[PDB]
Amino acid sequence: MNKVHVSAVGTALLKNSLSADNVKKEVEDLGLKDWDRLKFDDDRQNKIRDNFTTLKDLLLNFLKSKGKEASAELDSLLSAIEKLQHKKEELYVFLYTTNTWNSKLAGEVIKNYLEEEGIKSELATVKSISSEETFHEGIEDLFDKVIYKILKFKEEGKEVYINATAGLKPETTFLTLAGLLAGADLVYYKYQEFNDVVFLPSPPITISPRYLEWLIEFANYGYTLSEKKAEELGIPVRLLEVRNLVERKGEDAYRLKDWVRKMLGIYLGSEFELE
Amino acid sequence: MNKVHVSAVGTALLKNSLSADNVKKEVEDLGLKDWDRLKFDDDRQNKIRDNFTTLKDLLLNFLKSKGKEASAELDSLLSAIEKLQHKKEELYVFLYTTNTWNSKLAGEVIKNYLEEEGIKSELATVKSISSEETFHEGIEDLFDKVIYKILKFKEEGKEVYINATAGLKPETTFLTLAGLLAGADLVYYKYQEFNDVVFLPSPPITISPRYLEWLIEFANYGYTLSEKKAEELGIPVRLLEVRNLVERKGEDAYRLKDWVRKMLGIYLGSEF
């Protein structure tokens, strides 16, 4: 399957499904009125868990009934696949979603629909972003679970298409940029009020070689540099600091920020810190 | 003003302002009940135009009253300014929005509010994206009105912070990517959720140099090349085409897509 689509899955499907009276009955009787908006540690997530199969078949029947438009994910996926003329034999759909029952439900339902339609696909899950503290881990997890998989796909000799329709804005802005750094071929988006997908300018990009040399340099010296050592290596720490590439750690020292190291992994391999 | 913040302006302010009865009254009497969602060619846009100044004063008063929380733009702007400890003296706020009356209204209101708060700013306007056909023009326009300005700011030795909070996904993903290609320093985002700005991974990036050389090559021979010329110059037009950089217009011929032209002829020259 040499043509891979990457798509986040949200819970809009959960919400959209309440249109239908049968779904609204079943969800209301289970106590799950706001199942699209549940927090990751809300107890109602265990009611989705405990009732997974049912809610699955119910959302897949809703989906069959009223068709792909109930999920912006499917709509943009299936529209892009139509417009690019990607054959079912050639296709793979790498879904990811947060590690929460309402999201996994949406994700399993969409996975099964794609498989009923002759499209092989996979659903990875990723850490929730529930605060400023969990955001940076959230992004590292997307690196590990998605960006590094885009890398694998590109080594495998495949074409990668990013579906930017789905996902929260910051998480898809990150996926688009990291995705293209990892060699993704094309980024697409379906406007809610259009039927056709558009192709975002997806130019082939790499970290500035100037900055790539500097950033690899911290790796030689224990990911830290005094101002005097940086200046001797010609590395403008005060500009790296503006660009949130380094943090000042103490009076004289600058440490290469952890997110940069994840991203360097695109260039030096995912396990380069362990060699 | 060494520190520029870039921010789209959406109409969410127009919608949020309906939670004051005076605004909702004036909106309903004027026929403007869904003014946040009006398309670019909707006739109700002329009611905003015809009433611009008064609807300005109305939204600015609502905004003073209830403060920056009424606008994702102000909220994220003022929060990022707070978190980065940028002084008002050193700031310039580059707002852009579509050339539509409901958008310009939101944008003028945000511009005046920032100026009342001692922050200099401009409001650039850009062509509306109303279809597949107008999308590519829309993106060329963002290049001309925003990306090229990010470039100018960076030649001046100013620092550019992109506020990714407001904007539709495709307009903000393009601003982030082309913004960083133009040398923008940092991209930030404020979740409504947890009321606090985060810094998105924003490495300095460039066009792949192999491709930059190929792309500048097309720019020497008009902006079209036969298959026999391309393979002679060692250019995988096959791979340019997959990455939407060239179209096959001609017979055995390839044409450099217009947006690529307007991205070369923004960051790395200004000729042909």
- Supply the DSSP string of A30-49, one letter for each residue: HT-TTTTS--TT-THHHHHH
Using DSSP bridges, classify how beta strands B196-200 and B186-191 pair: parallel, antiparallel or unpaired: antiparallel
Contacts of residue B37 in chain A, CB cutoff 8 Å?
A: none
Written as six digits, the tokens of A231 are 């200046």
Written as six digits, the tokens of A51 are 């009732």
Cα–Cα dist B241/B64, whole Å:
51
Q: What angle do CA A132, A136, A137 make, to 5 degrees?
A: 110
DSSP secondary structure string, A202-239?
Answer: ---EEE-HHHHHHHHHHHHTTSEEEHHHHHHHT--HHH
**Other beta carbons less than 10 A from residue B202's beta carbon:** 24
CA–CA min distance A166, chain B (Å) = 10
User: Which has the closest alpha carbon to B21: B73, B65, B51?
Assistant: B65
- Domains with residue ranges and CATH for chain A: 3-200 (3.40.50.10770), 209-274 (1.10.10.1690)
CA–CA min distance B57, chain A (Å) = 31
Q: How far is CA B231 from CA A212, B99, B225, B246, in A?
A: 31, 44, 10, 15
- Sign of the C-alpha dihedral, residues A71, A73, A78, A84? positive
User: Which has the closest alpha carbon to A211: A267, A142, A275, A269?
Assistant: A267
Q: What angle do CA A182, A128, B196 make, to 5 degrees?
A: 95
Length of chain B: 272
Q: How far is CA A227 from CA A219, A223, A224, A245, in A?
A: 16, 13, 10, 15
Q: What is the resolution of this structure in A?
A: 2.7
Does A205 contact B205 at a Cβ distance shorter than 8 Å? yes
Place of tokens 């309906």: B18
CA–CA min distance B3, chain A (Å) = 11
User: What angle separates helix A169-181 from helix A258-268, to the nearest 10 degrees?
Assistant: 40
Interface contacts (A, B; CB < 8 Å): 142
Q: Which of A141, A244, A247 to mutate to test the interface with B (most CBs of B within 10 A)?
A: A244
CA–CA min distance B47, chain A (Å) = 23
Beta strands in chain A (DSSP E): 3-8, 91-98, 120-126, 159-163, 186-190, 197-200, 205-207, 224-226, 246-248, 253-256
Does A263 contact B174 at a Cβ distance shorter than 8 Å? no
**Residue A96 DSSP code:** E
User: Which has the closest alpha carbon to B111: B96, B100, B101, B126?
Assistant: B96
**Other beta carbons less than 10 A from residue A145's beta carbon:** 16
Sheet holding A224-226, edge to edge: A224-226, A253-256, A246-248
Cα–Cα dist A66/B65, whole Å:
45
Q: How far is CA B128 from the centre of its chain?
A: 11
Cα–Cα dist A247/A224, whole Å:
9
Chain B: residue whose CA lies nearest to A180: B177
Written as six digits, the tokens of B80 are 């990022």
Written as six digits, the tokens of A77 are 């996926």
Does B243 contact A196 at a Cβ distance shorter than 8 Å? no
Helix, strand, coil share (%) of chain A residues, nearest 5: 55, 15, 30
Does A191 contact B199 at a Cβ distance shorter than 8 Å? no
Written as six digits, the tokens of A120 are 């092989």
Stretch (H or E) spanning B63: helix B52-66
Measured in degrees and rounded to the nearest 5, phi and psi for residue B200 equal: -75, 145
Contacts of residue B259 in chain A, CB cutoff 8 Å?
A: 201
CB distance A270 to A151 below 8 Å: yes
Using DSSP bridges, classify how beta strands A253-256 and B3-8 pair: parallel, antiparallel or unpaired: unpaired
Those residues whose C-beta lies under 8 Å from the C-beta of residue B211, and which sit 6 or more positions away, are A203, A204, B240, B245
Does A242 contact B159 at a Cβ distance shorter than 8 Å? yes
Solving technique for this entry? X-ray
